[PDB]
């Protein structure tokens, strides 16, 4: 009597067929944008979605040719647009799928396109264990094989299912069928997004990386940096990347000719195009420019000498810190004036040692010493008339000269001026002098002096003024021979 | 007549209720190895996953109930388990569901329960996009407003969809309900898994970081490294990291004290438990430790100098470049025999260049020089009995004397020989001597001579032995005084 409870399966189905197309094709576009915009994975999956969509698609049309063919001859309302149920009990519509006990062309064809149904989900899909369950569903609601009956014999499933049954009962197991091709196929899209993006998330796709703020050290400092899970995938194409380098497997190789001095940067992005967002990663990486090494130490080693009583220039250098970061220090040490410059003038003792210490950009202080030997001003070199050794010329030169002193090859600008000498000639005693002129006492004791005399100067004492004034122990005599 | 089309729906529909079971257990399991293994994103969805499990669970269970009272006094067969499908046409089981016109307490229950289950889907999953179209399918399938029959009045859900009807046509609309429970359950199972891993492989979690191969460079070299998007999600929850750090946001900050000296490695690893394998991510990090600098350069600039016919011993160092990898040379330059241990002879010249190249550990070369002072050896001092100056003693002393010169303060450790020289006594010419010693000529000059009496030497020639030999031009006079 009920063929309105037969009415409403089919109205059920058939709007959840009408949802499924929307919810469908909504499904599926996000996965063709993650496709489009992330690729690699999400490609994939879209590959394999829409290979589904038409196997699925050919075989809920073809269903919806053989429901036409049920309820052929039956005037579905002008505004309501529903079918008369209660006229629908015959089956005779589909009388032609049918022959005797076995089918006709029809019949065969129907059997041949649901097989294509499988067979093709079962292409499209792999042998993945995700769209396993998938398949096993397609191939238990579409098992075609015959039907045993009460009786316990088999019957073909297309007799057994839809012949003489009632139009509007056909129908709704034909709209049945189609239900489970859109469940199957919004299955397939939704399984193929979270597959795709399982492989994605994968840790499989990363490289450990130590990045240290340095990679230069000294003992003691605190190394510092982090160690991070860097993208190392094919499947992972940026939209794009700005910097010197290029993309391989998610990862750009850089490479530059270092800069001129002091920090650079090196800069620029990877931008990804994400849900109608562009989402930039900026970078800013660091490294610094470091001159070469350009100052050698040559020193002469019998050299390491400074001078009492004279002003001694020092030059301080210390390699690898700031010139204004050099501090040296030492008894009777001074600034010259210029940076590293100083002047030494040494204290009592055989030996100066000048101490340099040195600040290091990290505030590190460094230290280094050296010992210089301290020597006496050598002799000077007696002279008459500003010549040394033995002085020739008139007895009258002689009366009137100068006595004086000289430091030859000595470095230093200094005073020296003679204090008093000794003078002497045969046959008289000794005259010792005070001042660097003859005496009167000096004239007196030469009147008896001529041609091929000699006059020795001796004991000169003389006076030196540089850093402070000092009487020399010791002046090289000096000779004058009368011509 | 046929309730076997009725049957063959319900068969079909438990069917599927059977394999569903399995099949969301299946997919549920997936979403909670990932959970426990991956957990972020993967905990949220297995959260949600867990409360549309119960609230599926209550209501399937609940339509169970009533399918049970709608096959009510009905014999399942023995070993087929099928219900007679004929015997089933009223619906005088679910009687006690309505009353009149209107609901008793029993059906006014059944409404509150398919309001509960779309009311609790609702609550498990959120308003988030990716489950909008799962709400809008439970809303439409399960709305439960009056229906319009033929007439066009109102008639209540329950009464409109199984007052009066066959037992196995309301069986069967139950079963219908439960393949949609289970098929929403599966839809979020299968889209919360989605929506977790796409949210794990958004760009949104990295930043990009510049990892170069050293951070201090010389101009002209070829910086080289890597530009890597490094993980930085709070989500990213690594089993465990080996290393001198902890993980924040699936990063590790690391720190150490710098080691001794040369090359260091920062050793360690990441590992993921991921689908039952334990996938380590090992890493190498590298670091050097240089020396402090330690060597200053302090020197007397008036100091360098260099003596023409000695041997003077230099120093080579160049800071920032190995001592087996320097290379000092100059005319007149040698080996001493000691790592950047030289001596210099000078040749002819007022200057001596000494050049040195360093070899840098990267094969660069780096130039430095410094130019000395090329000075002649000073002038000696005559000396009679090894005495400078004024020598006295008696005419018997000076007669057997030997005639010398003093280098004195000279650093050096040379040979001096007297060649000649010239003695001279008051009223006879002077004598010229060859050899160091008094002549015959100088013992016959000298019988004149007594107490008081001074005798010059002078215009002493002095050769020189060191580096080769030499005539010195110049020695300073000596004198003997007779007592």
């Known amino acids: 009597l009920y063929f309105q409870s037969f009415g409403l399966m089919n109205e059920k189905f058939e709007a959840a067929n009408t949802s499924s197309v929307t919810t469908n094709e909504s499904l599926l576009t996000s ?21 589904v969509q038409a196997a699925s698609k050919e075989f809920y049309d073809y269903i919806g040719t053989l429901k036409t063919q049920a309820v052929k001859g039956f005037e579905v309302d002008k505004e309501t647009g529903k079918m008369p149920y209660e006229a629908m009990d015959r089956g005779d519509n589909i009388d032609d799928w049918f022959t005797g006990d076995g089918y006709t062309k029809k019949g065969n064809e129907i059997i041949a396109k649901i097989e294509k149904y499988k067979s093709d989900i079962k292409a499209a899909l792999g042998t993945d264990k995700k769209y396993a369950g998938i398949i096993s569903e397609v191939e238990k609601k579409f098992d075609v094989s015959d039907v045993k009956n009460k009786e316990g014999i088999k019957e073909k499933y297309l007799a057994y299912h839809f012949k003489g049954f009632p139009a509007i009962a056909s129908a709704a197991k034909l709209s049945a069928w189609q239900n489970d091709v859109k469940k199957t196929e919004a299955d397939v899209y939704n399984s193929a997004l979270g597959k795709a993006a399982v492989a994605a998330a994968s840790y499989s796709n990363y490289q450990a990386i130590v990045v240290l703020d340095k990679n230069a050290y000294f003992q003691g400092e605190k190394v510092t940096g982090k160690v991070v899970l860097g993208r190392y995938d094919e499947n992972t194409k940026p939209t794009s990347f700005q910097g010197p380098g290029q993309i391989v497997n998610g990862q750009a190789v850089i490479s530059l000719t270092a800069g001129g001095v002091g920090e650079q940067d090196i800069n620029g992005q990877f931008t990804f195009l994400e849900d109608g967002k562009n989402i930039p990663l900026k970078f800013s990486g660091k490294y610094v420019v470091v001159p070469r090494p350009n100052s050698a130490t040559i020193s002469a080693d019998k050299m390491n000498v400074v001078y009492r009583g004279v002003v001694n220039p020092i030059s301080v250098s210390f390699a690898g810190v700031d010139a204004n970061k050099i501090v040296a220090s030492a008894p009777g040490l ?11 003038s040494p204290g009592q003792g055989t030996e100066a040692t000048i101490s340099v210490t040195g600040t290091l950009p990290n505030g590190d202080k460094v230290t280094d010493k050296k010992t210089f030997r301290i020597k006496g001003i050598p002799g000077p070199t007696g002279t008459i008339r500003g010549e040394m050794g033995v002085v020739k010329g008139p007895k009258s030169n002689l009366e009137i000269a100068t006595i004086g002193a000289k430091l030859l090859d000595f470095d230093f600008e200094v005073g020296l001026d003679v204090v008093g000498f000794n003078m002497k000639i045969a046959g008289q005693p000794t005259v010792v002098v005070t001042g660097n002129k003859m005496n009167a006492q000096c004239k007196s004791v030469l009147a008896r002096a001529g041609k091929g005399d000699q006059v020795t100067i001796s004991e000169i004492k003389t006076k030196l003024v540089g850093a402070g004034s000092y009487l020399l122990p010791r002046t090289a005599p000096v000779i004058y021979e009368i011509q």
Chains 1, 2 share one sequence.
């Open 31 to 51: 996965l063709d944008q993650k496709a489009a915009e992330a690729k690699g994975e999400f490609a994939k999956a879209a590959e394999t979605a829409h290979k």
């Open 334 to 344: 001074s600034s010259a004036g210029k940076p590293g410059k100083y002047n030494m």
